[PDB]
Amino acid sequence: EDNKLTYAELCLTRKTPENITISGRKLLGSRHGLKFENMSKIQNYYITYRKKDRHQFVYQIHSHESITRRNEEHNEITPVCVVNV
Length: 85
What we know:
Elements: E1 8-9, H1 17-27, E2 45-52, E3 56-63, H2 64-73, E4 77-84
Parallel strand pairs: 1-4
Antiparallel strand pairs: 2-3, 2-4
């Protein structure tokens, strides 16, 4: 829905972590509907977005471990609904 997302399905030709992130970055750079303004606990790949000044955001897929690592290194990358690859 507008607020919460049920589930996301990604379909590729090969299942590798680098290809998953590349596909998530490329497929989520076109014209989209909303900004995924919600939250859900995470525990494993997810679609995430970081905030950036003057209404700027990036849409790409990160693993939960990678989400934690990039939150530790860094504007937090708040994760949203799970992605099944």
